[PDB]
Design a protein around this ligand. Structure first.
Ligand SMILES: O=C1Cc2cc(Nc3nc(Cl)ncc3Br)ccc2N1
Ligand SMILES: O=C1Cc2cc(Nc3nc(Cl)ncc3Br)ccc2N1
Ligand SMILES: [Cl-]
Ligand SMILES: [Cl-]
Lengths: 4, 124, 124, 4
């Protein structure tokens, strides 16, 4: 999971 | 927004769509290319091809279970492109590049057409 | 093999599937969550959820146009997860994390359950 | 396009  | 994103989600979805294709699950159309038949999901074809997008948004054609392609279309070229649609991988070879490019132009698959044109320009 | 790969293909396919959902094109099922209704593509639901995979591979349920979820399921939690399925983006907030995790457990969406459990562990 |  990432900060888009 | 303040959303988080799962990097591999799109890849995992496509992998699962390809597993459904392999087991013939919920395929809703047959694409006829000369003597060959290819089963697929209308939504995936539309998501990958400008030609299928136009076909299945047509109020009459959207209901067809069989689509016949132009007789000039090569079944191997179509098979390679159908595999690309469901996997992101393109089996481009010296022996098939001309058929693949002609099929991608007909199917309106711009990124495939672009890489074929570049690979052809390199060999001249 | 000797294939080449188009990095953005899976993302572009999912973006197009979401455009079809937004315009209600070729959606083939309604998911009922209490008083709310959500239209979607069976193949996309199956590709994202262990529960929908089991439902639509069932020889009788595969033909249903309406699926009713358990009444304990929160429509907002479902909406957030349906958006995630079609975009890879999860709108996870302090006010919705419990409903989102409960819905992801029911839908069998393991990666969503995992991030919810981690975000909850961080706030305790 | 990349070599996968
Ligand atoms: O080279 C390509 C690939 C492709 C795909 C689609 N598909 C869709 N396009 C849009 Cl805008 N909305 C929903 C869908 Br499905 C249209 C055109 C093209 N040209
Ligand atoms: O957390 C998750 C997400 C998910 C998706 C599917 N979907 C499919 N799985 C397989 Cl093996 N083949 C085709 C399909 Br469609 C099954 C289980 C799960 N559990
Ligand atoms: Cl393309
Ligand atoms: Cl997930």
């Amino acid at each position: 999971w990432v900060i888009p | 927004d303040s959303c988080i994103q799962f990097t591999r989600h799109a890849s995992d979805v496509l992998l699962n769509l390809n597993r459904l294709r392999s087991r013939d699950i919920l395929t809703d159309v047959v694409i006829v290319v000369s003597r060959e038949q290819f089963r697929a999901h209308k939504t995936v074809l539309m998501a990958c091809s400008g030609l299928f997008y136009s076909i299945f948004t047509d109020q009459l054609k959207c209901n067809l279970s069989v689509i016949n392609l132009d007789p000039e279309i090569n079944p191997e070229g179509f098979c390679i492109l159908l595999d690309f649609m469901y996997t992101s991988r393109l089996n481009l070879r010296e022996g098939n590049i001309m058929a693949v490019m002609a099929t991608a132009m007909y199917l309106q698959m711009e990124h495939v057409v672009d890489t074929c044109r570049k690979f052809i320009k390199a060999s001249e």
